[PDB]
Enzyme design. Structure first.
Site, PDB file in Angstrom:
ATOM      1  N   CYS A 154      11.744  47.168 -57.398  1.00  0.00           N
ATOM      2  CA  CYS A 154      12.749  47.580 -55.866  1.00  0.00           C
ATOM      3  C   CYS A 154      12.708  48.522 -55.614  1.00  0.00           C
ATOM      4  CB  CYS A 154      13.923  46.501 -56.481  1.00  0.00           C
ATOM      5  SG  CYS A 154      15.918  47.147 -55.452  1.00  0.00           S
ATOM      6  N   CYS A 174       5.650  48.913 -39.491  1.00  0.00           N
ATOM      7  CA  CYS A 174       5.363  49.288 -40.499  1.00  0.00           C
ATOM      8  C   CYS A 174       3.224  48.865 -40.863  1.00  0.00           C
ATOM      9  CB  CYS A 174       5.727  48.607 -41.703  1.00  0.00           C
ATOM     10  SG  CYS A 174       5.321  47.158 -42.237  1.00  0.00           S
ATOM     11  N   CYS A 182       6.174  35.315 -48.447  1.00  0.00           N
ATOM     12  CA  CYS A 182       7.272  35.753 -47.332  1.00  0.00           C
ATOM     13  C   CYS A 182       7.156  37.403 -47.763  1.00  0.00           C
ATOM     14  CB  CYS A 182       8.359  34.976 -47.274  1.00  0.00           C
ATOM     15  SG  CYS A 182       9.400  36.211 -46.977  1.00  0.00           S
TER      16      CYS A 182
END
Ligand SMILES: [Zn+2]
Ligand SMILES: [Zn+2]
Ligand SMILES: [Zn+2]
Ligand SMILES: [Zn+2]
Ligand SMILES: [Zn+2]
Ligand SMILES: [Zn+2]
Lengths: 152, 411
Positions: free
Chosen positions: B220, B265, B233
């Site tokens: 994370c 991106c 996803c």
């Protein structure tokens, strides 16, 4: 995996009963039977001053796939790399015949030990040493054998 | 149109066997050797006759290539009845044959003949007695594939289906690099043999498979708790109490500036390759998790059946749209990596981003947000989403193809 063990049982029974002079000290895990060990004792220099530990490894699908011999003792030979793997032709997946016996496989390994085949080697630099300057190689391999060998 | 036809390895063998036996009446060899001969001359029946008399056959043939005992392979005893042999007189129990043959017809070291199992000898087992000794039609099919591969390679209007246990051939009227469909379902490019790859040309895909031949988990950005990816996803919501923030898995930047004109991106010489390969490989990995959605949706479609099979259809369609789009997407990153930046490339990159976002939204609804939603609302939501995903994908491909019609693209 079971039919392999059943065959190796009969092979291993015929070995310990008739004998192999050049291949001694046969230890097999009786639970498994797919993983033998032993000590080769060559008769020709540059290796007749010592012995070498090999480990055979029969797959589950033996005898329809070949075993895989790997040396545990380090050796100076053009046909055996430093990690221990041997390039024995009779054992390769292309040539392997399921009617080939383990005793024949090993006799053939001692052929290779006693007469190095530099034509299709694993240590390509050792193969050059062997052909281009025999006397020197035989001495290099002798002192490696004496330094890393096993008592007969 | 682009017409074609699918034949089975059974049919494509009958084709060969007939092609053999029209040569084999002239030269009178056994059926199995003629095959090896004809294979060696790439199925030119002429350059075979201009050697099968011209020279000495030995050089040709060289260029191409105890009864109450136990079985010498398994060591068990049987009645003589069960011992089959070849022309060498080496005999073995009819099961060891079947076991030998079978394991010999599995990839590593197969050419296109199998020899006798005896030590030493290499008298080949003739094609027809291989079929007779092996049993299971799954294996048998593979053998047929292997002896016929030469025949099908040497013919420019037949390609094999790439699916691993399908042995069918597509037969065409001309080769074109259009898409053909096997009847196991697999859709492939007829010219190059790989999976269908709409925006990118076959050449640039070959180059990208060789160059690509030589991270499962990540942390994370905010709270650094190790996140294994479970689902294709890339809209990642953080499974934690401290930080419930959202972030795109690839770039690890934030959601939802994604799906806007400002933040992109997907736009960027080995530092570069790593950027485009990362996105390709990610989209590929994602596609695998995407396939396992036919499970999860049928659990919801089964739960909607009890509260039927008519509704269950739209969620399948949704997952089939999503898979096709991911697949395109994957390949748009191949096409972009090889692309000299020009006037059209900017517009392409925007379409790529439109499709990428429109995929993530569909991909993430079927993975998360559907179950956090009522039953009457999700038919509309899912449909509106995959219909849009499909347009953005179709807009993207329409664009490159225009450029190809006018050589807009450089490399
Ligand atoms: Zn047998
Ligand atoms: Zn034979
Ligand atoms: Zn198929
Ligand atoms: Zn292609
Ligand atoms: Zn977090
Ligand atoms: Zn991103």
């Amino acid at each position: 995996s079971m039919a392999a063990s059943r065959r190796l049982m009969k092979e291993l029974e015929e070995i310990r009963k008739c004998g192999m002079k050049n291949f001694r000290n046969i230890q097999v895990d009786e639970a498994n039977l797919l993983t033998w060990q032993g000590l080769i004792v060559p008769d020709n220099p540059p290796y007749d001053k010592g012995a070498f530990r090999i480990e055979i490894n029969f797959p589950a699908e033996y005898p329809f796939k070949p075993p895989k011999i790997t040396f545990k003792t380090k050796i100076y030979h053009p046909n055996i790399d430093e990690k221990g793997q041997v390039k024995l032709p009779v054992i390769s997946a292309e040539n392997w015949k399921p009617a080939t016996k383990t005793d024949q496989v090993i006799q053939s390994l001692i052929a290779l030990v006693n007469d190095p085949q530099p034509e299709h080697p694993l240590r390509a630099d050792l193969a050059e040493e062997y052909s281009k300057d025999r006397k020197k190689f035989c001495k290099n391999a002798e002192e490696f054998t004496k330094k890393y060998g096993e008592k007969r | 149109d682009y017409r074609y036809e699918v034949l089975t390895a059974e049919q494509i063998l009958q084709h060969m066997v007939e092609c053999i036996r029209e040569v084999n009446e002239v030269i009178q060899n056994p059926a199995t050797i003629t095959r090896i001969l004809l294979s060696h001359f790439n199925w030119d029946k002429e350059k075979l006759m201009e050697r099968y008399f011209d020279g000495n056959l030995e050089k040709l043939f060289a260029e191409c290539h105890a009864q109450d005992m136990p079985c010498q392979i398994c060591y068990l005893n049987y009645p003589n009845s069960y011992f089959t042999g070849l022309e060498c007189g080496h005999k073995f129990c009819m099961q060891c044959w079947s076991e030998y043959l079978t394991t010999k017809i599995m990839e590593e070291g197969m050419g296109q003949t199998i020899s006798c199992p005896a030590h030493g000898c290499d008298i080949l087992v003739d094609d027809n007695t291989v079929m007779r000794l092996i049993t299971d039609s799954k294996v048998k099919l593979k053998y047929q594939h292997l002896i016929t591969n030469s025949f099908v390679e040497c013919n420019r209007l037949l390609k094999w289906c790439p699916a691993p246990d399908c042995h069918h051939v597509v037969k065409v009227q001309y080769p074109d690099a259009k898409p053909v469909r096997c009847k196991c379902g697999r859709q492939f490019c007829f010219n190059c043999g790989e999976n269908w790859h709409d925006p990118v040309k076959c050449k640039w895909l070959k180059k990208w498979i060789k160059k690509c031949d030589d991270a499962n988990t990540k942390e994370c950005p905010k709270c650094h708790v190790t996140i294994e990816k479970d689902g294709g996803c890339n809209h990642m919501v953080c499974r934690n109490q401290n930080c419930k923030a959202e972030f795109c898995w690839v770039c690890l930047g934030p959601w939802e500036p994604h799906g806007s004109a400002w933040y992109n991106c997907n736009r960027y010489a080995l530092q570069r390759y790593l950027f485009y390969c990362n996105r390709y490989m990610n989209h590929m990995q994602s596609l695998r998790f995407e396939h396992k959605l036919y499970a999860q949706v049928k659990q919801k479609m089964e739960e909607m059946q009890q509260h039927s099979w008519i509704e269950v259809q739209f969620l399948k369609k949704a997952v089939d749209v999503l898979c096709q789009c991911r697949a395109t997407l994957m390949y748009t990153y191949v096409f972009a990596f090889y692309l000299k930046k020009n006037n059209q490339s900017i517009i392409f990159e925007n379409n790529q981003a439109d499709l990428e976002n429109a995929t993530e939204v569909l991909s993430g609804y079927l993975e998360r947000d559907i179950s956090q939603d009522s039953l009457q609302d999700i038919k509309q939501k899912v449909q509106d989403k995959y219909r849009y995903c499909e347009s953005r994908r179709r807009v993207l491909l329409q664009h490159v193809h225009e450029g190809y019609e006018k050589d807009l693209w450089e490399y």
